[PDB]
Amino acid sequence: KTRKESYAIYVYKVLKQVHPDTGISSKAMSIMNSFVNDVFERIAGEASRLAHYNKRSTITSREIQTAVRLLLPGELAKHAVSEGTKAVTKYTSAK
Amino acid sequence: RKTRKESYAIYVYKVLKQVHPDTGISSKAMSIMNSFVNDVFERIAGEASRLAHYNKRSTITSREIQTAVRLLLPGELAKHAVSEGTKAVTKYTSAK
Amino acid sequence: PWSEERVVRKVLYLSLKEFKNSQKRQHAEGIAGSL
Amino acid sequence: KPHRYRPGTVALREIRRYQKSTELLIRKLPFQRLVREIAQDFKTDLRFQSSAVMALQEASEAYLVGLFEDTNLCAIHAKRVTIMPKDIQLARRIRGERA
Amino acid sequence: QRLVREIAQDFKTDLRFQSSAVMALQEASEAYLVGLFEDTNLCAIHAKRVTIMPKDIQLARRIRGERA
Amino acid sequence: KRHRKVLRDNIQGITKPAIRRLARRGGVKRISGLIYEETRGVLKVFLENVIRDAVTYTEHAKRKTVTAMDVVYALKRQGRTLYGFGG
Amino acid sequence: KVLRDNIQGITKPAIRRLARRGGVKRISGLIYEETRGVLKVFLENVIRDAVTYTEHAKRKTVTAMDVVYALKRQGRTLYGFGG
Amino acid sequence: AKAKTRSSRAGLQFPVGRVHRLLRKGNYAERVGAGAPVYLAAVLEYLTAEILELAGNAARDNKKTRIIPRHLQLAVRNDEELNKLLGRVTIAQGGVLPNIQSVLLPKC
Amino acid sequence: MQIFVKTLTGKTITLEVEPSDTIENVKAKIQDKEGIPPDQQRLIFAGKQLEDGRTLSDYNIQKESTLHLVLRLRGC
Amino acid sequence: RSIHVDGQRGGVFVCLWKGCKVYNTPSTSQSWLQRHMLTHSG
DNA sequence: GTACGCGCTGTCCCCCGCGTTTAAACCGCCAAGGGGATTACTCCCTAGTCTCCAGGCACGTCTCAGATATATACATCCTG
DNA sequence: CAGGATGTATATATCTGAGACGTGCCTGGAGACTAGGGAGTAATCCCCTTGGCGGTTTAAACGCGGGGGACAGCGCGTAC
Ligand SMILES: [Zn+2]
């Protein structure tokens, strides 16, 4: 018992959207789990400070945007920011 | 002339004379000590922050700080400082 | 004002193999978007 | 009559061999013994999960490997082909480890 | 100062530089080079020489974890 | 007789051919003979550092059993994160 | 003689000076290039993030505290200039 | 009635509800905006997609059906822009990149 | 545009090349017209060793220029 | 050192002298005590 | 046996002063724009209920994954 | 300076069976649906400090040369 969370299912889904026909071993799932669990904090912690400096109290997108501009090196930043911008401005249009 | 700032300068100075009661101190060195204190305070705090969440408590206690020291200060300084803090508490307990 | 001759004498003397980058990974700049 | 290979040629095959596989390189039971040995001095009467030891190993090995590689570059810098403790002690200091 | 103002041209134009910050930039940019040269020196010595050549710098950085 | 068979000189449990294997994986060709003690000490220092904090955590959580998470946290604090063990 | 892309502003004797405080004795002829590039690289890697902070704060002038932060980022803390 | 997943309303796959829970309970700030968890989840999804895709080709080029760590290693270490992001991580069961110095080869 | 590639053996060859051609492509042309492998060649002009990734326009080379090629063996 | 310094056993540096700029002033570091003694008495 | 290690050498290429050319400093003057404080407000995110469905757990298989067995090219290291 | 013999490689066949993939079930946490009140937010104004400037002056940079010593090359013994 004592349920645990994970990201397995979502990983598998995303996998199916690129090589729709390729399996994934067990451990190589646990890895890709831990990896997300890492990057998540490595961004959220940074954004926390970044807000705390200018003495705000809320976290919004804008900083997450900046915070990304700091960690991801170069072209990955160029892409990810476009991705975010897009995949939010849609959502706000249709709640 | 408004919007007061803060520092530790007072306390640096006070504890200074308790050791070299004849010595002065420039401004730059004052600022440096200030920054240094700020650094260390944060390090130790942030450490204990995780230490709780791991065991999923919700309040920082002394016991937290105790170990959190043992993970930053190398060797000797740790053994000294833990003694120090242990003492400083005991008194405060009885001496409200 | 450029010591090309001196650097060429150095090329003749040192004369050792050198290592550098090989491939162009522009695909990480490309298909990544189409990913 | 009996065939014997050129000196040092076996290695050139050893490398291309090992740089491919992925499994461990140290037999467990002695390693586990060693760990349990060191552990006593901090708080004797301990008890371990299995995977914990596996982890400890995994890291140790990855460390040593990465260390050797840079040791090698050092050794080349001085136009040798072997290695010597004087080499390790260089990298182990430039890194800032034994700084 | 003329240097940094030049490099700052790209990431944006028409910036202003609070004076003191330039001092910090300078200062930190120097304690870097010092410690660098130090390690280059140890490197070169290890090869039984007395003078330092660019390959020393390159090796030093690589081991340090900057170039690769 | 229950426990505490304190063993000594297990560092010699690291055979020379073992270390040969590692070095090979590293990519070295010719090897001196003194190294077989250099590494025997280097590795020990490395271990000690980790195992200390490893213990420290459990101790704080006051059990008698060193889980894997513990080791993970330790290896992280020193800037050597490790994937694949339930981060 | 005024045409000077500021990178040239790093005079060779200057480099020699730092080299001394390090503790080097002799010096090849080429290093006076390696340094000019290395310093450059190191510089952008910091001025970029400094800029970034200023931007996100909507400001228009590079406060020291920014440069300090950016320096703590790379793993190079710096005492004294405030913080 | 007839509720809809926020992820749908975004058109993604990551549990935006789950994320937005995590931020509140992580002491990351005092109060969380609305748009953030969206933006965050989008970034995460993009990243993991990129890496998985690369690994897929990696393993196929070895002519196998599934994906195992050794692939992931051989996947990351070959793309620098990634490789920097993972300067200090260690993938168990990872091996190394095949590599040999140029000098130690025979004369020809 | 035409260029002159003077070699250490007293031979100075002409190539067909554009300012947008890279030094890797120029070395490929050296291979195709002389059999000299591109991994063995190092071209020199304007006091610098030519970089394969850059083009002729990047070095600001004019017509009728006389470039220098040294045979540098890597490997073996 | 045998008459005033060693007889000054304590965590304080209250040790006395005629003509010192600091006089009857405590100090929590006895090392600095003996240091000041070596400075003054010569 | 080969890789090392020691010694001999024949350089040419940095150090070291010397004139001389200069750009840095400092000193002063000046303008403004942008940063920093102050005000009125609003609308957005927190809180609280009610609910119902996505997600975790336990099974059960079949596979195709993989394993294993078998068999041929090829790259060394010798000979004339 | 080229062939022959070689142990290595490499492939191809068999099973064989643990364990990725579904598959149901059940439920607690995510979502719809409610007010509220303060964090941000425009809007404001008023320094000020940062560029920007124009003379000295002067030490620091610069170019020259010359020479001497560090080095890269080469050769030879050997012991690990
Ligand atoms: Zn006195």
UniProtKB/Swiss-Prot annotation, chain A:
Give an example GO cellular component term for this record: nucleus
Q: Which residues are glycosylated?
A: S82
Q: Which residues form the signal peptide?
A: none
- Fill in the PTM field for this protein: Monoubiquitination of Lys-90 by BRE1 gives a specific tag for epigenetic transcriptional activation and is also prerequisite for histone H3 'Lys-4' and 'Lys-79' methylation.
Coiled-coil spans are none
Q: Which GO terms describe its molecular function?
A: DNA binding; protein heterodimerization activity; structural constituent of chromatin
Q: Where does this polypeptide localize?
A: Nucleus; Chromosome
Site of covalent link Glycyl lysine isopeptide (Lys-Gly) (interchain with G-Cter in ubiquitin) = K90
UniProt keyword terms in alphabetical order:
Acetylation, Chromosome, DNA-binding, Glycoprotein, Isopeptide bond, Nucleosome core, Nucleus, Phosphoprotein, Ubl conjugation
Family membership noted in the UniProt record: Belongs to the histone H2B family.
The protein's role, per its UniProt record:
Core component of nucleosome. Nucleosomes wrap and compact DNA into chromatin, limiting DNA accessibility to the cellular machineries which require DNA as a template. Histones thereby play a central role in transcription regulation, DNA repair, DNA replication and chromosomal stability. DNA accessibility is regulated via a complex set of post-translational modifications of histones, also called histone code, and nucleosome remodeling.
Quaternary organization: The nucleosome is a histone octamer containing two molecules each of H2A, H2B, H3 and H4 assembled in one H3-H4 heterotetramer and two H2A-H2B heterodimers. The octamer wraps approximately 147 bp of DNA.
The name of this protein is Histone H2B 1.1
Organism, scientific name: Xenopus laevis (African clawed frog)
Complete-protein stretch covered: 32 to 126 of 126
From Swiss-Prot, chain F:
Which residues, renumbered to this chain, carry the PTM N6-methylated lysine?
Answer: K5
**Residue positions, PTM N6-(2-hydroxyisobutyryl)lysine:** K1, K16, K29, K44, K62, K64, K76
Residue numbers of N6-butyryllysine PTMs:
K1, K16, K29, K62, K64, K76
Report the subcellular localization. Answer: Nucleus; Chromosome
Residues bearing PTM N6-lactoyllysine: K1, K16, K62, K76
In the record, which positions carry Phosphotyrosine? Y36, Y73
Q: Which residues carry this modification: N6-propionyllysine?
A: K1, K16, K29, K62, K64, K76
Spell out which residues are annotated as carrying N6,N6,N6-trimethyllysine: K5
The Gene Ontology terms for molecular function here are: DNA binding; protein heterodimerization activity; structural constituent of chromatin
Q: Which residues carry this modification: N6-glutaryllysine?
A: K16, K44, K62, K64, K76
- N6-acetyllysine carried by residues: K1, K16, K44, K64, K76
Q: Which residues carry this modification: N6-succinyllysine?
A: K16, K62, K76
DNA-binding region location? 1-5
Query: Which cysteine-cysteine pairs are annotated as disulfide bonds in the entry?
Result: none
Q: Which residues carry this modification: N6,N6-dimethyllysine?
A: K5
Q: How is it modified after translation?
A: Demethylation is performed by JMJD6. Monomethylated, dimethylated or trimethylated at Lys-5 (H4K20me1, H4K20me2, H4K20me3). Monomethylation is performed by KMT5A/SET8. Trimethylation is performed by KMT5B and KMT5C and induces gene silencing.
Q: Which residues carry this modification: N6-methyllysine?
A: K5
Superkingdom, according to UniProt?
A: Eukaryota
| Positions bearing Phosphoserine | S32
Glycyl lysine isopeptide (Lys-Gly) (interchain with G-Cter in ubiquitin) cross-link: located at: K76
GO cellular component: a single term: nucleus
Give an example GO biological process: nucleosome assembly
The UniProt subunit note reads as follows: The nucleosome is a histone octamer containing two molecules each of H2A, H2B, H3 and H4 assembled in one H3-H4 heterotetramer and two H2A-H2B heterodimers. The octamer wraps approximately 147 bp of DNA.
Identify its protein family: Belongs to the histone H4 family.
Q: What does this protein do?
A: Core component of nucleosome. Nucleosomes wrap and compact DNA into chromatin, limiting DNA accessibility to the cellular machineries which require DNA as a template. Histones thereby play a central role in transcription regulation, DNA repair, DNA replication and chromosomal stability. DNA accessibility is regulated via a complex set of post-translational modifications of histones, also called histone code, and nucleosome remodeling.
Swiss-Prot record, chain I:
Q: What is the effect of changing R72K?
A: No effect on ADP-ribosylation
Q: Which residues carry this modification: ADP-ribosylglycine?
A: C76
Which residues does the record list as (Microbial infection) ADP-ribosylthreonine (modified residue)?
Answer: T66
Q: Topology in the membrane?
A: Peripheral membrane protein
User: Cross-link Glycyl lysine isopeptide (Gly-Lys) (interchain with K-? in acceptor proteins) maps to which residues of the chain?
Assistant: C76
Q: How is it modified after translation?
A: Phosphorylated at Ser-65 by PINK1 during mitophagy. Phosphorylated ubiquitin specifically binds and activates parkin (PRKN), triggering mitophagy. Phosphorylation does not affect E1-mediated E2 charging of ubiquitin but affects discharging of E2 enzymes to form polyubiquitin chains. It also affects deubiquitination by deubiquitinase enzymes such as USP30. Mono-ADP-ribosylated at the C-terminus by PARP9, a component of the PPAR9-DTX3L complex. ADP-ribosylation requires processing by E1 and E2 enzymes and prevents ubiquitin conjugation to substrates such as histones.
Effect upon mutating S65A: Prevents phosphorylation in case of mitophagy. Decreased localization of PRKN to mitochondria
Query: What happens on changing R74K?
Result: No effect on ADP-ribosylation
Record-annotated Ubiquitin-like domain positions: 1-76
In the UniProt annotation, what is the result of changing G75 to R/Q?
No effect on ubiquitination by CRL2(KLHDC3) E3 ligase complex. Impairs ubiquitination by CRL2(KLHDC10) E3 ligase complex
In the UniProt annotation, what is the result of changing T7D? Impairs ubiquitination by CRL2(KLHDC3) E3 ligase complex
Q: What is this protein called?
A: Ubiquitin
Gene giving rise to this polypeptide: UBC
Section of the entire sequence shown: 1 to 76 of 685
Curated annotation (Swiss-Prot), chain J:
Q: Where are the zinc fingers (C2H2-type)?
A: 18-40
Subcellular location field: Nucleus
Classify the source by domain of life.
Answer: Eukaryota
State the similarity comment: Belongs to the AEBP2/jing C2H2-type zinc-finger family.
Listed under subunit, the entry gives: Self-associates. Associates with the PRC2 complex, which consists of the core components EED, EZH1 or EZH2, SUZ12, and RBBP4, and various combinations of accessory subunits including AEBP2, JARID2, PHF19, MTF2 and EPOP. Found in a monomeric PRC2.2 (class 2) complex consisting of at least SUZ12, RBBP4, AEBP2 and JARID2. Within the PRC2 complex, interacts directly with SUZ12; competes with PHF19 for SUZ12 binding. Interacts with EED, EZH2, and RBBP4. May also interact with RBBP7.
The free-text function statement in the UniProt record for this protein reads: Acts as an accessory subunit for the core Polycomb repressive complex 2 (PRC2), which mediates histone H3K27 (H3K27me3) trimethylation on chromatin leading to transcriptional repression of the affected target gene. Plays a role in nucleosome localization of the PRC2 complex.
Protein name in UniProt: Zinc finger protein AEBP2
**What is the source species?**
Homo sapiens (Human)
Instruction: Recite the lineage of the species.
Output: Eukaryota, Metazoa, Chordata, Craniata, Vertebrata
